[PDB]
């Protein structure tokens, strides 16, 4: 398709051609063309095999969990909240222009829920989630029990030697490790069928009521209302609690009045975000702003008025590498056992992780590509009566020590943190670190912080945080893991990484493994497992230079920790991904071999190159499990690209000719009030930056066969940007050009960028050419002037006795193209710009010539040109020589 498609708004998407013009009446109300009422929006759209593929959410929807009987969940059928989301197929019915037509449906249905699900879901308790205004002093919890208050008690710390043997714990030289982090109080949890509130705290450390829905209707809600009151089109204090409301309208968040709908209805709602399309399947996954707990698998195939279903993560089995790597995430889920009545938590109920925060998905060949972090879930100790972990969430630093063998295998399944804490503050001699130094009796026991008398008289049940953090514990390890700055004290100085915290999650998922998905969705009666072998995870911290003052040598931990993020974070810790697409390599490789692909993402102050070995539709890798896996390369942001607010990610295009991604940023997409309930006004505006392939890519020689180097990628902010303009779209016409469509009163400007040695600025004289086109599609070709189209001059009548060619024939002249080209003089507006003469017998004696001429685009347009099949009627001068022969 040569035209480009352009989301208006909410409902309309408009074709525009090259020259950044409408094509007339191609502006479609896409939601009433899907037969859906006024309350449905466009969510994500894309092509596959010329059909446009649109996924609609309603903001009327309302979901219901009823924790007790079966079919738990369900939409609010009572007022009108049955409004679940949509996939739709529309495909071009005319040949002149664009008339778009409903094709197939797919209603999205919530998902079946097993008695056994049901039981962990019970007590499921999800973090409020996390938003441009969120502080690190928001996200800091309460220090838990530590891992001899949990065990022996309240008698003393000197039995520790004596007393771990009985307790599991031989050779475990850290009594004062964290068990994790309280929840009385700090960022709200709630169930399923409460509601999340606006009000964050700034320093959650004392301001939260955390999970305690009771002490927050009851004492605290009235007193953050006091200091954080709603804009009105008071202005108080914001000692305590920041007002969120407008930031999580932002991120999808639904609303009744100025509540927030329950925790159940806003995964739903997040959850119908992205969606891929193969010959076989459409694909639908969530936001990068909430955790997911499922995704769609539609069979295109599929019947009308069918309900298609999602299928669990918690029954989505990832390779996360090694094995060792899976077991760490698993360990922390919750306690295991055999002995314990109502103990329901996703891990003692033999799932697996059960929450991304979705990067992004794509199709490629006839594979689904995703990534994303690992969302934060572990266990909380939820009994009453007297139980010591009691409103205690258990989660601790699966960081590596720092005596592990350097080398990635070796590194990532060190036993170090797997079966329970380990990781605090040590001291050797006078060299200080939060990482156990050691990994003669026999091993070094790890274990779960839950004492064994109190086995079967404990409540651990499952939560779900708000980020790719595991421990909230508001101590050193916390900031270290986080921030990226465990490192050994060896030769070469080598980085140490967590298994639970800060996880990236990538793949590339086939048909068959798609058919399970299915197949776990619509199983009945008990939960039917589902293995995507095609994946891997890596530790992706946020880059330390995000934050200030870091002490190494009061040690500096989330309550302290200053920020300087310059991403539209006000956090520091916390990492978010955003806008995975996928491309073909457009650079050919040594035949017998596909096609080259890879995908990236952005990722806090980096991009993240995904590779792939087209041969088999599987991950790089390389023989050697020293290196680290070659699947996954990531290159730093410079100062330019770290300005960009990942806030504001609107659009990524790839284009299979230039081999470079397009990620579009616009400031329209902020909040429209700060946590302080101050209006933004720097929402004018937008920002493009350009991602391209780095590296020695794979199959371009015998020599490329194999690779022990990650072909990497590189993310420029562009020189495309604006903070005046408010955008409309970004049409990528060619590695040489781009064109921006935008208002600065209410009427749409075009402005052309030009590429300068790979910085794109301004041409002032291109933009205000390709403007001047009559209000038709294609600017104006202009007799005296080198406009878009440059300028012709033709050769006089005369040329012909000049050069002898009255004695050679039309039909002759015609069939020799380098002999009309000498027929004009071409001026060119951009660098090797060309232009053709077509001739046309006339008469027996005559012939006429007419040019053929470059845009920016890279195309050749003429007097018969078309977009869409509607004749541009560009308007190439053209010109009769007169006086040839007849022999
Ligand atoms: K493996
Ligand atoms: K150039």
Redesign the pocket.
């Known amino acids: 398709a040569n035209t480009f498609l352009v989301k208006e708004d909410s409902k309309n998407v408009t074709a525009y051609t090259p020259f950044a013009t409408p094509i007339t009446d191609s502006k479609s109300d896409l939601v009433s063309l899907a037969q859906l009422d006024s309350s449905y929006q466009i969510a994500d759209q894309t092509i596959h095999n010329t059909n446009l593929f649109v996924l609609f959410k309603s903001r009327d929807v309302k979901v219901k969990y009823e924790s007790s009987g079966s079919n738990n969940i369900s939409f609010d059928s009572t007022s009108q909240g049955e409004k679940p989301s949509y996939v739709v197929e529309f495909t071009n019915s005319t040949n002149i222009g664009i008339k778009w037509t409903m094709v197939k449906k797919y209603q999205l249905d919530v998902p079946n829920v097993s008695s056994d699900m049901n039981q962990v879901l019970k007590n499921l308790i999800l973090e409020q989630p996390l938003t441009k205004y969120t502080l690190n002093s928001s996200l800091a919890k309460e220090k838990g029990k530590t891992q001899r208050e949990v065990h022996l008690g309240s008698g003393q710390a000197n039995q520790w030697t004596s007393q771990r043997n009985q307790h599991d714990l031989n050779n475990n030289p850290s009594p004062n490790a964290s068990t994790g982090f309280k929840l009385t109080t700090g960022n709200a949890y709630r169930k399923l069928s409460e509601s999340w509130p606006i009000y964050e705290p700034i320093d959650g450390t004392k301001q939260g009521k955390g999970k305690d829905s009771s002490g927050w209707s009851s004492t605290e809600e009235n007193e953050a209302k006091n200091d954080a009151p709603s804009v009105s089109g008071s202005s108080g204090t914001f000692n305590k609690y920041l007002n969120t409301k407008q930031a999580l309208e932002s991120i999808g968040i639904l609303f009744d009045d100025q509540t927030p709908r329950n925790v159940i209805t806003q995964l739903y709602y997040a959850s119908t975000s992205k969606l891929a399309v193969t010959n076989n399947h459409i694909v639908v996954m969530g936001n990068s702003f909430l955790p997911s707990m499922w995704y769609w698998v539609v069979e295109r195939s599929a019947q009308e008025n069918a309900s298609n279903k999602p299928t669990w993560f918690a029954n989505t089995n990832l390779d996360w590498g090694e094995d060792k790597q899976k077991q760490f995430v698993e360990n922390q889920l919750g306690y295991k056992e055999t002995t314990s009545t109502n103990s329901h938590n996703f891990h003692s109920k033999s799932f697996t992780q059960p929450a991304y925060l979705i990067s992004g998905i794509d199709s490629v060949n006839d594979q689904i590509i995703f990534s994303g972090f690992k969302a934060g879930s572990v266990g909380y100790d939820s009994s009453s009566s007297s139980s010591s972990t009691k409103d205690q969430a258990l989660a601790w630093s699966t960081t590596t020590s720092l005596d592990s063998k350097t080398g990635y295998k070796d590194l990532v399944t060190n036993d170090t943190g797997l079966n329970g804490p380990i990781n605090g503050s040590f001291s050797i001699q006078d060299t200080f670190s939060f990482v156990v130094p050691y990994s003669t009796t026999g091993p070094i026991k790890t274990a779960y912080p839950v004492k064994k008398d109190q086995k079967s008289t404990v409540k651990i049940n499952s939560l779900i945080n708000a980020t790719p953090l595991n421990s909230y514990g508001d101590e050193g390890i916390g900031v270290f893991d986080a921030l990226g700055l465990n490192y050994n004290f060896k030769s070469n100085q080598e980085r140490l990484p967590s298994r639970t915290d800060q996880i990236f999650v990538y793949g590339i998922v086939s048909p068959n493994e798609l058919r399970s998905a299915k197949s776990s969705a619509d199983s009945t009666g008990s939960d039917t497992k589902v293995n995507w072998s095609n994946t891997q995870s890596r530790y992706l911290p946020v880059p330390y230079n995000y934050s200030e003052g870091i002490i190494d040598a009061s040690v500096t931990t989330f309550s302290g920790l200053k920020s300087i993020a310059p991403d539209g974070f006000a956090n520091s810790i916390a990492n978010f991904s955003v806008g995975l697409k996928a491309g073909i390599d457009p650079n050919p490789v040594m035949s017998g071999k596909k096609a080259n692909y890879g995908a990236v993402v952005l990722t806090r102050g980096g991009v993240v190159r995904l590779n792939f070995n087209p041969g088999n539709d599987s991950l790089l890798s390389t023989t050697d499990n020293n290196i680290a896996p070659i699947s996954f390369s990531f290159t730093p942001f410079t100062a330019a690209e770290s300005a960009v607010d990942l806030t504001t990610f609107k659009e990524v295009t790839y284009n299979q000719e230039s081999g470079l991604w397009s990620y579009i940023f616009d400031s329209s997409l902020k909040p429209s009030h700060d946590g302080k309930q101050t209006p933004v006004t720097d929402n004018m505006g937008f920002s493009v930056i350009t991602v391209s392939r780095t590296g020695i890519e794979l199959n371009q020689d015998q020599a490329t066969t194999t690779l022990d180097v990650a072909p990497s990628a590189l993310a420029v902010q562009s020189g495309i940007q604006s903070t005046t303009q408010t955008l409309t779209g970004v049409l990528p016409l060619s590695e ?1 050009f781009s064109a921006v469509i935008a208002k600065d009163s209410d009427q749409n400007k075009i402005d052309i960028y ?4 790979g910085l794109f600025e301004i041409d002032t004289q291109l933009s205000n050419s390709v403007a001047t086109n009559n209000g038709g599609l294609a600017p104006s070709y202009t007799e005296n002037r080198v406009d878009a189209w440059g300028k012709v001059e033709f050769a006089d009548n005369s040329v012909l006795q000049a050069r002898n060619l009255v004695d050679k024939t039309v039909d002759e002249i015609i069939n020799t193209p380098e002999i009309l080209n000498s027929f004009f003089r071409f001026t060119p507006a951009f ?1 090797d710009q060309k232009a053709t003469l077509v001739a046309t017998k006339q008469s027996d004696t005559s012939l006429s010539v007419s040019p053929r001429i470059q845009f920016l685009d890279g195309n050749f347009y003429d007097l018969n040109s078309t977009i869409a099949g509607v004749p541009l009627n560009i308007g190439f001068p053209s010109r009769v020589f007169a006086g040839f022969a007849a022999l």
């Open positions: 040489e030009k590429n300068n040695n660098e």
